[PDB]
Amino acid sequence: RNLRDLLAPWVPDAPSRALREMTLDSRVAAAGDLFVAVVGHQADGRRYIPQAIAQGVAAIIAEAKDEATDGEIREMHGVPVIYLSQLNERLSALAGRFYHEPSDNLRLVGVTGTNGKTTTTQLLAQWSQLLGEISAVMGTVGNGLLGKVIPGSAVDVQHELAGLVDQGATFCAMEVSSHGLVQHRVAALKFAASVFTNLSRDHLDYHGDMEHYEAAKWLLYSEHHCGQAIINADDEVGRRWLAKLPDAVAVSMEDHINPNCHGRWLKATEVNYHDSGATIRFSSSWGDGEIESHLMGAFNVSNLLLALATLLALGYPLADLLKTAARLQPVCGRMEVFTAPGKPTVVVDYAHTPDALEKALQAARLHCAGKLWCVFGCGGDRDKGKRPLMGAIAEEFADVAVVTDDNPRTEEPRAIINDILAGMLDAGHAKVMEGRAEAVTCAVMQAKENDVVLVAGKGHEDYQIVGNQRLDYSDRVTVARLLGVIA
């Protein structure tokens, strides 16, 4: 880490200074640090140059806008201050070089879209590690090697990737947000591949608005090192982009592959949704096969097929992917299935809004030969408007609604349940059972072998809040003990 080597691609005359860390914040700047002074969200980091100098930073790189020309080298208190124009745009490349290009020292796959980013990244990291990578994730759940994921400027992204490379990671699956892409947070990253799940943007009904949105996105991907493109052809926007990208991989589970293109493709031909997951039959330009997925619902078929197409595009052999597919796991507490010989199917899911609850029930219904049970409640001392909507959704999409407690906090637990029931056409056909453990047991012990019990609202969140008390309680553990299995 040397200022002269750091800036050699952009500023040839830069003095030699040993550098420690790269920071945007004068308050945490230490002796030897490189301070980077950016103009940002109603803030000007150049205001904090004197504090950064007083903390003993070795050098400063600063926005040139209205202060200096691009590449201008100044000196303040014997500290080099180098000015760069458009420093927000260049910060990714600057940090990339500072951290020795971490995206050139592992296989980085980016995942963009409205939904399925978390699941698709976890599947990419898991499947790659089953084939012998040391894989890592960066996303909304956090950053780290698989099993060690812990809960963001262009500098933080490059630093975190460098941290993963230092820990032995050879593969990283990164959730990329629309906001991250637009604010140049991944601008200099070398993506081996870019995955598009779907675009659920309301607000885009006007042709000029859809045109400008698409124009902004096309411009961004012309500026990035996207690598191989893997696109969900079941998304209308995905299909429009596939029509313009002949080297992209088209993925479908709904017959949207156009075979006249002679491009690379992967298509589910048949799915059997059953008690413990999905049997997925598929054809592809790499060959055909059948996958035993332990994930639940149609959207998770799509997520898995995107991850498969990505790894096939990157050269992972179909035979090795097929042989490891049965080891792919759900995201913990997301449509997580619990089965046992001769027992009902139980799905634990985090769903705690009307929309998540409807999606979870629709997904669970596909796997349900008998009756669909829904065990749920609503949090106390929070917004109450969702209570009757969740009741109506449970009544509509489930055969048996079992309304119980879910963190009633200091609110009268039955008050919450009354709000849920008020949303129903026939409240009298809902079951009510208090104790959540008792309500889960009720559903699981009454359900038939070919029934599906959805236990919604907690997922992995191993507590029940009653009054001021965080009680030890887990849906996953309660269901596991009832079924005689290990959570």
CSV table of C-alpha atoms in Angstrom, one decimal:
chain,number,residue,atom,x,y,z
A,1,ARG,CA,0.0,0.0,0.0
A,2,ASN,CA,1.8,3.1,-1.4
A,3,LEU,CA,0.2,6.3,-2.6
A,4,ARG,CA,2.4,6.5,-5.7
A,5,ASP,CA,1.6,2.9,-6.8
A,6,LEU,CA,-2.1,3.4,-5.8
A,7,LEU,CA,-2.4,6.5,-8.1
A,8,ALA,CA,0.0,5.4,-10.9
A,9,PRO,CA,-2.9,4.6,-13.4
A,10,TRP,CA,-4.4,8.1,-12.9
A,11,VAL,CA,-1.6,10.5,-11.4
A,12,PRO,CA,2.0,9.6,-12.5
A,13,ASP,CA,3.7,12.2,-10.3
A,14,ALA,CA,2.2,11.1,-6.8
A,15,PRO,CA,4.7,11.1,-3.9
A,16,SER,CA,5.7,7.8,-2.2
A,17,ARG,CA,3.9,7.4,1.1
A,18,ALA,CA,3.3,4.1,3.0
A,19,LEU,CA,-0.5,3.8,3.6
A,20,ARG,CA,-2.3,1.9,6.4
A,21,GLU,CA,-6.1,1.8,5.8
A,22,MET,CA,-8.4,3.7,3.5
A,23,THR,CA,-11.2,5.7,5.3
A,24,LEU,CA,-14.0,8.2,4.3
A,25,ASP,CA,-14.5,9.2,8.0
A,26,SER,CA,-12.0,11.6,9.7
A,27,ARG,CA,-13.2,10.4,13.2
A,28,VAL,CA,-11.8,6.8,12.7
A,29,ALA,CA,-8.7,8.0,10.6
A,30,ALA,CA,-5.4,6.8,12.3
A,31,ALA,CA,-1.7,7.4,11.8
A,32,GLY,CA,-0.6,6.2,8.3
A,33,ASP,CA,-4.2,6.2,6.9
A,34,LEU,CA,-5.4,7.4,3.5
A,35,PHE,CA,-8.3,9.8,4.1
A,36,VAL,CA,-10.7,10.1,1.1
A,37,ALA,CA,-12.7,13.4,1.1
A,38,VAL,CA,-15.9,12.9,-1.0
A,39,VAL,CA,-18.9,15.3,-1.7
A,40,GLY,CA,-22.0,13.2,-0.9
A,41,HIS,CA,-25.5,13.2,0.7
A,42,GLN,CA,-25.5,17.0,1.8
A,43,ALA,CA,-21.9,16.5,3.2
A,44,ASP,CA,-18.5,17.7,2.0
A,45,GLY,CA,-15.6,15.4,3.4
A,46,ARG,CA,-13.1,18.1,2.5
A,47,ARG,CA,-14.4,20.1,5.5
A,48,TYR,CA,-12.7,17.3,7.7
A,49,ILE,CA,-9.2,17.5,6.0
A,50,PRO,CA,-7.7,19.5,9.1
A,51,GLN,CA,-9.0,16.8,11.6
A,52,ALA,CA,-7.7,14.0,9.3
A,53,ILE,CA,-4.3,15.7,9.1
A,54,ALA,CA,-4.4,16.1,13.0
A,55,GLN,CA,-5.1,12.3,13.4
A,56,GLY,CA,-1.7,11.9,11.4
A,57,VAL,CA,-3.1,10.5,8.0
A,58,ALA,CA,-0.2,9.9,5.6
A,59,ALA,CA,-2.2,11.3,2.6
A,60,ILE,CA,-5.5,12.6,1.3
A,61,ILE,CA,-7.4,12.1,-2.0
A,62,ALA,CA,-10.2,14.8,-2.4
A,63,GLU,CA,-13.0,15.8,-4.8
A,64,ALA,CA,-11.6,18.4,-7.3
A,65,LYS,CA,-15.1,20.0,-8.0
A,66,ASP,CA,-14.7,23.8,-7.7
A,67,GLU,CA,-11.4,23.5,-5.7
A,68,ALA,CA,-8.7,22.1,-8.1
A,69,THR,CA,-8.0,20.5,-11.5
A,70,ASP,CA,-8.1,16.7,-12.0
A,71,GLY,CA,-4.8,15.1,-10.9
A,72,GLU,CA,-3.7,18.3,-9.0
A,73,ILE,CA,-1.1,17.4,-6.2
A,74,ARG,CA,-1.2,19.9,-3.3
A,75,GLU,CA,0.6,19.7,0.1
A,76,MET,CA,-1.0,20.9,3.5
A,77,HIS,CA,1.0,20.5,6.8
A,78,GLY,CA,3.5,18.2,4.9
A,79,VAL,CA,0.6,15.9,3.9
A,80,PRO,CA,0.0,15.1,0.2
A,81,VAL,CA,-3.6,16.2,-0.9
A,82,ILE,CA,-4.4,14.8,-4.4
A,83,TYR,CA,-7.6,16.1,-6.1
A,84,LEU,CA,-9.6,13.9,-8.5
A,85,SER,CA,-12.8,15.0,-10.4
A,86,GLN,CA,-15.8,12.6,-10.2
A,87,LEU,CA,-14.2,10.9,-7.1
A,88,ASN,CA,-17.6,9.2,-6.2
A,89,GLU,CA,-17.5,7.5,-9.7
A,90,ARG,CA,-13.8,6.4,-9.3
A,91,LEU,CA,-13.9,5.4,-5.6
A,92,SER,CA,-14.6,1.7,-6.5
A,93,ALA,CA,-11.5,1.5,-8.8
A,94,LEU,CA,-9.4,3.5,-6.2
A,95,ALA,CA,-10.3,1.1,-3.3
A,96,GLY,CA,-10.1,-2.0,-5.7
A,97,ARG,CA,-6.4,-1.1,-6.4
A,98,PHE,CA,-5.8,-0.2,-2.7
A,99,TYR,CA,-7.0,-3.7,-1.6
A,100,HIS,CA,-5.1,-5.5,-4.5
A,101,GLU,CA,-8.1,-6.2,-6.7
A,102,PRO,CA,-10.0,-8.8,-4.6
A,103,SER,CA,-12.6,-9.4,-7.4
A,104,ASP,CA,-9.7,-10.6,-9.6
A,105,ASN,CA,-8.6,-13.1,-6.8
A,106,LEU,CA,-12.0,-14.9,-6.5
A,107,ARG,CA,-15.0,-15.8,-8.7
A,108,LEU,CA,-17.6,-13.0,-8.0
A,109,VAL,CA,-21.2,-13.6,-9.1
A,110,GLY,CA,-23.7,-10.6,-8.8
A,111,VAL,CA,-27.4,-11.1,-8.4
A,112,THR,CA,-29.8,-8.2,-9.2
A,113,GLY,CA,-33.7,-8.0,-9.2
A,114,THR,CA,-36.6,-7.3,-6.9
A,115,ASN,CA,-37.0,-10.8,-5.3
A,116,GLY,CA,-35.0,-14.0,-4.7
A,117,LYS,CA,-31.6,-12.3,-4.4
A,118,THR,CA,-30.9,-13.8,-0.9
A,119,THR,CA,-31.9,-17.4,-1.9
A,120,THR,CA,-30.1,-17.2,-5.3
A,121,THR,CA,-26.9,-16.0,-3.7
A,122,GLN,CA,-27.0,-18.7,-0.9
A,123,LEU,CA,-27.7,-21.4,-3.6
A,124,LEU,CA,-24.7,-20.1,-5.7
A,125,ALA,CA,-22.4,-20.0,-2.7
A,126,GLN,CA,-23.6,-23.5,-1.4
A,127,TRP,CA,-23.5,-25.3,-4.8
A,128,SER,CA,-20.0,-23.8,-5.7
A,129,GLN,CA,-18.7,-25.0,-2.2
A,130,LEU,CA,-20.2,-28.5,-2.8
A,131,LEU,CA,-18.1,-28.6,-6.0
A,132,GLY,CA,-14.9,-27.7,-3.9
A,133,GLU,CA,-14.8,-23.8,-3.8
A,134,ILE,CA,-14.5,-22.0,-0.4
A,135,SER,CA,-17.6,-19.8,-1.0
A,136,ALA,CA,-18.8,-16.6,0.7
A,137,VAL,CA,-21.9,-14.3,0.5
A,138,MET,CA,-22.4,-10.5,0.7
A,139,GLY,CA,-26.0,-9.4,1.0
A,140,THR,CA,-28.8,-8.2,3.3
A,141,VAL,CA,-28.3,-11.2,5.7
A,142,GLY,CA,-24.6,-10.1,6.1
A,143,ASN,CA,-21.1,-11.0,4.7
A,144,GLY,CA,-18.8,-14.0,5.3
A,145,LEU,CA,-17.7,-17.5,4.4
A,146,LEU,CA,-20.8,-19.9,4.5
A,147,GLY,CA,-21.8,-20.7,8.1
A,148,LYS,CA,-19.9,-17.6,9.3
A,149,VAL,CA,-22.1,-14.8,7.8
A,150,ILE,CA,-22.4,-11.8,10.2
A,151,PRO,CA,-24.7,-8.7,9.7
A,152,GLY,CA,-21.8,0.4,2.6
A,153,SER,CA,-19.6,2.8,0.5
A,154,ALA,CA,-17.6,1.6,-2.6
A,155,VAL,CA,-14.5,1.4,-0.1
A,156,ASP,CA,-16.5,-0.9,2.4
A,157,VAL,CA,-17.4,-3.3,-0.5
A,158,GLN,CA,-13.8,-3.6,-1.7
A,159,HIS,CA,-12.5,-3.9,1.9
A,160,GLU,CA,-15.1,-6.6,2.7
A,161,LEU,CA,-14.2,-8.6,-0.5
A,162,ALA,CA,-10.4,-8.3,0.4
A,163,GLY,CA,-11.4,-9.6,3.9
A,164,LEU,CA,-13.1,-12.7,2.2
A,165,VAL,CA,-10.0,-13.3,-0.1
A,166,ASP,CA,-7.7,-13.1,3.0
A,167,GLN,CA,-9.9,-15.8,4.7
A,168,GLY,CA,-9.4,-18.2,1.7
A,169,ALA,CA,-12.7,-17.5,-0.3
A,170,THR,CA,-12.4,-18.5,-4.0
A,171,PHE,CA,-16.1,-17.8,-4.7
A,172,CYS,CA,-18.4,-14.9,-3.6
A,173,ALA,CA,-22.2,-14.5,-4.4
A,174,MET,CA,-23.2,-10.8,-3.9
A,175,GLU,CA,-26.7,-9.4,-3.8
A,176,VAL,CA,-26.5,-6.2,-5.9
A,177,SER,CA,-29.2,-3.5,-5.1
A,178,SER,CA,-30.4,-1.0,-7.7
A,179,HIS,CA,-29.2,1.7,-5.2
A,180,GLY,CA,-25.7,0.1,-5.0
A,181,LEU,CA,-25.4,0.0,-8.8
A,182,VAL,CA,-26.6,3.6,-9.3
A,183,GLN,CA,-24.4,5.1,-6.5
A,184,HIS,CA,-21.3,3.4,-8.1
A,185,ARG,CA,-20.8,1.0,-5.1
A,186,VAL,CA,-19.7,-1.9,-7.4
A,187,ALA,CA,-18.5,0.1,-10.4
A,188,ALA,CA,-14.9,-1.5,-10.6
A,189,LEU,CA,-15.9,-5.0,-9.5
A,190,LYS,CA,-15.0,-7.8,-11.9
A,191,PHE,CA,-18.2,-9.9,-12.0
A,192,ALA,CA,-17.6,-13.4,-13.5
A,193,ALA,CA,-21.4,-13.5,-14.0
A,194,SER,CA,-24.5,-11.3,-13.4
A,195,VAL,CA,-27.9,-12.9,-12.6
A,196,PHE,CA,-31.3,-11.2,-13.1
A,197,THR,CA,-34.1,-12.7,-11.0
A,198,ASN,CA,-37.1,-10.4,-11.7
A,199,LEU,CA,-38.4,-6.7,-11.8
A,200,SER,CA,-41.5,-6.0,-9.7
A,201,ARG,CA,-41.3,-2.2,-10.0
A,202,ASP,CA,-44.7,-0.6,-9.8
A,203,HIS,CA,-44.5,3.1,-10.9
A,204,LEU,CA,-43.4,2.1,-14.4
A,205,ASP,CA,-46.9,2.1,-16.2
A,206,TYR,CA,-46.0,5.1,-18.5
A,207,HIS,CA,-43.9,4.1,-21.7
A,208,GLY,CA,-41.5,7.1,-21.2
A,209,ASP,CA,-40.9,6.0,-17.5
A,210,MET,CA,-40.2,2.3,-18.5
A,211,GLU,CA,-38.0,3.7,-21.4
A,212,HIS,CA,-36.0,6.0,-19.0
A,213,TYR,CA,-35.7,3.2,-16.3
A,214,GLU,CA,-34.4,0.7,-18.9
A,215,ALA,CA,-32.2,3.4,-20.4
A,216,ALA,CA,-30.6,4.1,-17.0
A,217,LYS,CA,-30.0,0.4,-16.4
A,218,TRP,CA,-28.6,-0.3,-19.9
A,219,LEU,CA,-26.2,2.6,-19.4
A,220,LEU,CA,-25.0,1.1,-16.0
A,221,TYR,CA,-24.4,-2.4,-17.4
A,222,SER,CA,-22.5,-0.9,-20.4
A,223,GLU,CA,-20.2,0.7,-17.7
A,224,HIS,CA,-19.8,-2.5,-15.5
A,225,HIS,CA,-17.8,-5.7,-16.0
A,226,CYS,CA,-21.0,-7.9,-15.8
A,227,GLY,CA,-19.3,-11.1,-17.0
A,228,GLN,CA,-21.7,-13.8,-18.3
A,229,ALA,CA,-25.4,-12.7,-18.1
A,230,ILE,CA,-28.0,-15.2,-16.7
A,231,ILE,CA,-31.5,-13.8,-17.1
A,232,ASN,CA,-34.9,-15.1,-16.0
A,233,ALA,CA,-36.9,-15.4,-19.3
A,234,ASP,CA,-40.2,-15.7,-17.2
A,235,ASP,CA,-39.7,-11.9,-16.4
A,236,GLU,CA,-41.1,-9.6,-19.2
A,237,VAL,CA,-38.1,-7.2,-18.7
A,238,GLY,CA,-35.7,-10.2,-18.7
A,239,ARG,CA,-37.1,-11.3,-22.1
A,240,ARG,CA,-36.7,-7.8,-23.5
A,241,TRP,CA,-33.0,-7.8,-22.4
A,242,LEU,CA,-32.5,-11.4,-23.7
A,243,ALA,CA,-33.7,-10.3,-27.1
A,244,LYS,CA,-30.7,-7.8,-27.1
A,245,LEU,CA,-28.0,-10.1,-25.5
A,246,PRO,CA,-27.2,-13.1,-27.8
A,247,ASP,CA,-24.5,-14.4,-25.3
A,248,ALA,CA,-26.8,-14.3,-22.3
A,249,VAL,CA,-28.3,-17.5,-20.8
A,250,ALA,CA,-32.2,-17.7,-20.9
A,251,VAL,CA,-33.7,-19.5,-17.9
A,252,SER,CA,-37.5,-20.5,-17.8
A,253,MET,CA,-39.8,-22.8,-15.9
A,254,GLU,CA,-42.9,-21.4,-17.9
A,255,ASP,CA,-42.0,-22.1,-21.6
A,256,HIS,CA,-40.4,-18.6,-22.5
A,257,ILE,CA,-37.2,-20.0,-24.1
A,258,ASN,CA,-37.2,-19.1,-27.9
A,259,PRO,CA,-35.3,-22.1,-29.5
A,260,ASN,CA,-34.8,-20.2,-32.9
A,261,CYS,CA,-32.1,-18.0,-31.1
A,262,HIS,CA,-29.6,-20.9,-30.8
A,263,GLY,CA,-28.4,-19.2,-27.5
A,264,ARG,CA,-27.6,-21.0,-24.2
A,265,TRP,CA,-30.7,-22.0,-22.2
A,266,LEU,CA,-32.1,-23.9,-19.2
A,267,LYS,CA,-35.8,-24.9,-19.0
A,268,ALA,CA,-37.7,-26.8,-16.3
A,269,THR,CA,-39.9,-29.2,-18.5
A,270,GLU,CA,-41.7,-30.8,-15.5
A,271,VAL,CA,-41.9,-30.0,-11.7
A,272,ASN,CA,-43.5,-32.4,-9.1
A,273,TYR,CA,-44.1,-30.3,-5.9
A,274,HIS,CA,-44.2,-33.0,-3.1
A,275,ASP,CA,-44.1,-33.3,0.7
A,276,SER,CA,-40.3,-32.7,1.0
A,277,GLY,CA,-39.5,-30.4,-1.9
A,278,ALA,CA,-39.6,-30.4,-5.8
A,279,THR,CA,-38.5,-33.0,-8.4
A,280,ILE,CA,-37.3,-30.7,-11.2
A,281,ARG,CA,-36.9,-32.2,-14.7
A,282,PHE,CA,-35.0,-29.9,-17.1
A,283,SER,CA,-33.3,-29.6,-20.5
A,284,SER,CA,-30.4,-27.2,-21.3
A,285,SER,CA,-27.7,-26.5,-23.9
A,286,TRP,CA,-25.4,-28.4,-21.4
A,287,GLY,CA,-27.7,-31.5,-21.3
A,288,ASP,CA,-30.8,-32.7,-19.4
A,289,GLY,CA,-31.4,-34.0,-15.9
A,290,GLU,CA,-33.6,-34.3,-12.8
A,291,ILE,CA,-32.9,-32.4,-9.6
A,292,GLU,CA,-34.2,-33.3,-6.1
A,293,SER,CA,-34.6,-29.8,-4.5
A,294,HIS,CA,-35.3,-29.6,-0.7
A,295,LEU,CA,-36.6,-26.0,-1.3
A,296,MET,CA,-40.4,-25.2,-1.4
A,297,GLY,CA,-42.5,-23.3,-3.9
A,298,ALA,CA,-42.3,-22.2,-7.6
A,299,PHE,CA,-40.1,-19.1,-6.9
A,300,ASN,CA,-37.5,-21.4,-5.3
A,301,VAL,CA,-37.5,-23.6,-8.5
A,302,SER,CA,-36.7,-20.4,-10.4
A,303,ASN,CA,-33.9,-19.3,-7.9
A,304,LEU,CA,-32.4,-22.8,-8.1
A,305,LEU,CA,-32.5,-22.9,-12.0
A,306,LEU,CA,-30.8,-19.4,-12.1
A,307,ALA,CA,-28.1,-20.7,-9.8
A,308,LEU,CA,-27.7,-23.9,-12.0
A,309,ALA,CA,-27.5,-21.9,-15.3
A,310,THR,CA,-24.9,-19.6,-13.7
A,311,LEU,CA,-22.6,-22.4,-12.5
A,312,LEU,CA,-23.0,-24.2,-15.9
A,313,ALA,CA,-22.2,-20.9,-17.7
A,314,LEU,CA,-19.0,-20.6,-15.5
A,315,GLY,CA,-17.9,-24.2,-16.6
A,316,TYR,CA,-19.0,-26.3,-13.5
A,317,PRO,CA,-19.8,-29.8,-14.9
A,318,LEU,CA,-23.5,-30.7,-15.1
A,319,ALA,CA,-22.7,-34.2,-13.7
A,320,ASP,CA,-21.1,-32.7,-10.5
A,321,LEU,CA,-24.0,-30.2,-10.1
A,322,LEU,CA,-26.7,-32.9,-10.5
A,323,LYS,CA,-24.8,-35.1,-7.9
A,324,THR,CA,-24.8,-32.3,-5.3
A,325,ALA,CA,-28.2,-30.7,-5.9
A,326,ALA,CA,-29.9,-32.8,-3.1
A,327,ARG,CA,-27.5,-31.1,-0.5
A,328,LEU,CA,-28.8,-27.5,-1.3
A,329,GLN,CA,-30.5,-26.1,1.8
A,330,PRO,CA,-33.2,-23.5,2.2
A,331,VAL,CA,-32.3,-20.1,3.7
A,332,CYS,CA,-33.0,-20.8,7.5
A,333,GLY,CA,-36.6,-20.0,8.5
A,334,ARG,CA,-37.5,-19.3,4.8
A,335,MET,CA,-40.0,-22.0,3.5
A,336,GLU,CA,-37.9,-24.4,5.6
A,337,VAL,CA,-39.5,-27.9,5.3
A,338,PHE,CA,-39.7,-30.5,8.2
A,339,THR,CA,-40.9,-34.0,7.2
A,340,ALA,CA,-40.8,-37.4,9.0
A,341,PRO,CA,-42.0,-40.9,8.1
A,342,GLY,CA,-45.8,-41.0,8.3
A,343,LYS,CA,-46.1,-37.4,9.6
A,344,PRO,CA,-47.6,-34.2,8.1
A,345,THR,CA,-45.2,-31.8,6.2
A,346,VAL,CA,-44.4,-28.7,8.3
A,347,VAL,CA,-43.0,-25.5,6.8
A,348,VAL,CA,-41.5,-22.8,9.0
A,349,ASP,CA,-41.5,-19.4,7.3
A,350,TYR,CA,-40.7,-15.9,8.5
A,351,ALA,CA,-43.9,-14.5,6.7
A,352,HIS,CA,-45.3,-11.7,8.9
A,353,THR,CA,-47.1,-9.3,6.4
A,354,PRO,CA,-50.2,-9.9,4.3
A,355,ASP,CA,-48.1,-10.2,1.0
A,356,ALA,CA,-45.4,-12.7,2.5
A,357,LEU,CA,-48.2,-14.7,4.2
A,358,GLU,CA,-50.2,-15.1,0.8
A,359,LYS,CA,-46.9,-16.0,-1.1
A,360,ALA,CA,-45.9,-18.6,1.6
A,361,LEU,CA,-49.5,-20.2,1.5
A,362,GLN,CA,-49.5,-20.3,-2.3
A,363,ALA,CA,-46.0,-21.9,-2.3
A,364,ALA,CA,-47.0,-24.4,0.5
A,365,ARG,CA,-50.3,-25.2,-1.4
A,366,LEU,CA,-48.3,-26.6,-4.5
A,367,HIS,CA,-46.8,-29.3,-2.1
A,368,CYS,CA,-50.1,-30.1,-0.3
A,369,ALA,CA,-52.1,-33.2,-1.5
A,370,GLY,CA,-54.5,-32.9,1.6
A,371,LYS,CA,-55.4,-29.9,3.7
A,372,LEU,CA,-53.3,-26.7,4.2
A,373,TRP,CA,-53.1,-25.5,7.8
A,374,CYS,CA,-51.8,-22.0,8.7
A,375,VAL,CA,-50.5,-21.3,12.3
A,376,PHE,CA,-49.9,-17.6,12.8
A,377,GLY,CA,-50.4,-14.4,14.9
A,378,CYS,CA,-49.4,-10.7,14.7
A,379,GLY,CA,-46.9,-8.7,16.9
A,380,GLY,CA,-48.3,-6.6,19.7
A,381,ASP,CA,-47.5,-2.9,20.3
A,382,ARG,CA,-47.0,-2.4,16.4
A,383,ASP,CA,-49.2,-1.3,13.5
A,384,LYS,CA,-52.6,-3.1,13.6
A,385,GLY,CA,-53.8,-2.5,10.0
A,386,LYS,CA,-52.2,-5.8,8.8
A,387,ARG,CA,-54.1,-7.9,11.4
A,388,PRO,CA,-57.5,-8.2,9.5
A,389,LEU,CA,-55.6,-8.5,6.1
A,390,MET,CA,-53.6,-11.5,7.5
A,391,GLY,CA,-56.8,-13.0,8.8
A,392,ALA,CA,-58.5,-12.7,5.4
A,393,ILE,CA,-55.4,-14.2,3.6
A,394,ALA,CA,-55.2,-17.2,6.1
A,395,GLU,CA,-59.0,-17.9,5.6
A,396,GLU,CA,-58.7,-17.6,1.7
A,397,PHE,CA,-55.4,-19.4,1.0
A,398,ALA,CA,-55.5,-22.0,3.9
A,399,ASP,CA,-58.1,-24.8,4.6
A,400,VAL,CA,-57.5,-24.4,8.4
A,401,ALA,CA,-56.5,-21.1,10.1
A,402,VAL,CA,-55.0,-21.6,13.6
A,403,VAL,CA,-54.7,-18.0,15.1
A,404,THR,CA,-52.2,-17.8,18.1
A,405,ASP,CA,-49.7,-15.4,19.7
A,406,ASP,CA,-46.6,-14.0,18.0
A,407,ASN,CA,-44.7,-11.5,20.3
A,408,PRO,CA,-47.8,-10.0,21.9
A,409,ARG,CA,-45.4,-7.8,24.0
A,410,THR,CA,-47.5,-5.6,26.4
A,411,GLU,CA,-50.7,-5.8,24.3
A,412,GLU,CA,-53.6,-8.0,25.5
A,413,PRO,CA,-52.9,-11.2,23.4
A,414,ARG,CA,-56.6,-11.8,22.7
A,415,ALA,CA,-57.1,-8.1,21.5
A,416,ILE,CA,-54.6,-9.0,18.7
A,417,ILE,CA,-56.4,-12.2,17.9
A,418,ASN,CA,-59.8,-10.3,17.8
A,419,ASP,CA,-58.2,-7.9,15.2
A,420,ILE,CA,-57.1,-10.9,13.1
A,421,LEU,CA,-60.6,-12.6,13.3
A,422,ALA,CA,-62.4,-9.3,12.4
A,423,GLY,CA,-60.8,-9.5,8.9
A,424,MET,CA,-62.4,-12.9,8.2
A,425,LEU,CA,-65.7,-13.7,6.4
A,426,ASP,CA,-66.4,-16.6,8.9
A,427,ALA,CA,-64.3,-16.0,12.1
A,428,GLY,CA,-66.3,-18.9,13.6
A,429,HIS,CA,-64.5,-21.5,11.4
A,430,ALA,CA,-61.0,-20.2,12.5
A,431,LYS,CA,-59.3,-22.2,15.3
A,432,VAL,CA,-57.9,-20.0,18.2
A,433,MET,CA,-55.2,-21.5,20.5
A,434,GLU,CA,-53.0,-19.7,22.9
A,435,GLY,CA,-49.7,-20.7,23.8
A,436,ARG,CA,-48.0,-20.6,20.4
A,437,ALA,CA,-46.3,-24.0,21.3
A,438,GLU,CA,-49.9,-25.4,22.0
A,439,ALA,CA,-51.2,-24.0,18.7
A,440,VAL,CA,-48.3,-25.4,16.7
A,441,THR,CA,-48.8,-28.8,18.5
A,442,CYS,CA,-52.6,-28.6,17.8
A,443,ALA,CA,-52.0,-28.3,14.0
A,444,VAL,CA,-49.1,-30.8,13.8
A,445,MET,CA,-50.9,-33.5,15.9
A,446,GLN,CA,-54.3,-33.1,14.2
A,447,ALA,CA,-53.0,-32.8,10.6
A,448,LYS,CA,-53.1,-35.9,8.3
A,449,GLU,CA,-50.0,-37.5,6.7
A,450,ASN,CA,-50.6,-35.7,3.3
A,451,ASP,CA,-51.4,-32.3,5.0
A,452,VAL,CA,-49.1,-29.3,5.1
A,453,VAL,CA,-48.9,-27.1,8.2
A,454,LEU,CA,-47.4,-23.6,7.6
A,455,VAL,CA,-46.0,-22.1,10.8
A,456,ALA,CA,-45.6,-18.4,9.8
A,457,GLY,CA,-44.2,-15.2,11.4
A,458,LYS,CA,-40.9,-16.2,13.2
A,459,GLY,CA,-38.7,-18.3,10.8
A,460,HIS,CA,-35.3,-18.5,12.7
A,461,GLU,CA,-36.2,-15.8,15.4
A,462,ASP,CA,-35.8,-18.1,18.5
A,463,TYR,CA,-37.9,-16.0,21.0
A,464,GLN,CA,-41.5,-15.2,22.1
A,465,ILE,CA,-41.9,-11.7,23.7
A,466,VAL,CA,-44.6,-11.8,26.4
A,467,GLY,CA,-44.7,-8.6,28.5
A,468,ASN,CA,-41.1,-7.4,29.1
A,469,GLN,CA,-39.9,-11.1,28.9
A,470,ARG,CA,-37.9,-12.6,26.0
A,471,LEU,CA,-38.9,-16.3,26.5
A,472,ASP,CA,-36.8,-19.1,24.9
A,473,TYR,CA,-39.0,-20.4,22.1
A,474,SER,CA,-38.3,-21.7,18.6
A,475,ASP,CA,-40.9,-22.8,16.0
A,476,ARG,CA,-38.1,-24.9,14.3
A,477,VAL,CA,-37.3,-26.7,17.6
A,478,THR,CA,-41.0,-27.1,18.6
A,479,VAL,CA,-41.8,-28.6,15.1
A,480,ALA,CA,-38.6,-30.8,15.1
A,481,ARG,CA,-39.5,-32.4,18.6
A,482,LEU,CA,-43.1,-33.1,17.5
A,483,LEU,CA,-41.9,-34.8,14.3
A,484,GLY,CA,-39.1,-36.7,16.1
A,485,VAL,CA,-36.3,-34.9,14.0
A,486,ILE,CA,-33.3,-32.6,14.5
A,487,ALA,CA,-33.5,-28.8,14.0
